[PDB]
Amino acid sequence: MNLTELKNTPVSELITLGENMGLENLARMRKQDIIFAILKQHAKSGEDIFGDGVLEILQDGFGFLRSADSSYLAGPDDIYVSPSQIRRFNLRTGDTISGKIRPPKEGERYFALLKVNEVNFDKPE
Secondary structure (H helix, E strand, O other), X not given: OEHHHHHOOOHHHHHHHHHOOOOOOOOOOOHHHHHHHHHHHHHHOOOOEEEEEXXXXXXXXXXXXXXXXXXXXXXXXXXXXXXXXXXXXXXXXXXXXXXXXEOOOOOOOOEEEEEEEEEOOEOOO
C-alpha cells in the first residue's frame, strides 16, 4: 500500500478499505485524515507502507517530499526527510524520492521516510 495510490482513490472506496481493516467513523473525516488512519492501521499490522514525492530541503537542513503537482506547496501529507537521510544519499532539492514510510508517533505530525528505495527513479547507488 502506498500514499499516492490512496490519494488517488475515491473516498467511498477508501471508506470500504478502512472499514474492512477495523476502522470506523471514516465518512466524517477529511480524505487526508481517512488516508492517515488507513496507513497507520496497516503499518500497525506489520505491513510495509510506501510513499513518494519531490524533495525540497529547507533551511534547517531537513526536507519534505511533496506531490509533484503541488509545485512545492507544503501540505499535511508531506513526507519528512531527515538530514541524515539527505547526507546518506547526497539528496538534492528537486530530487524525486520513493521508499518505505512510517506513520507519525504520538505527538508526531508527519509521515516519515523510513527507507529510501529510489532516487530519481534509480537505485540510491
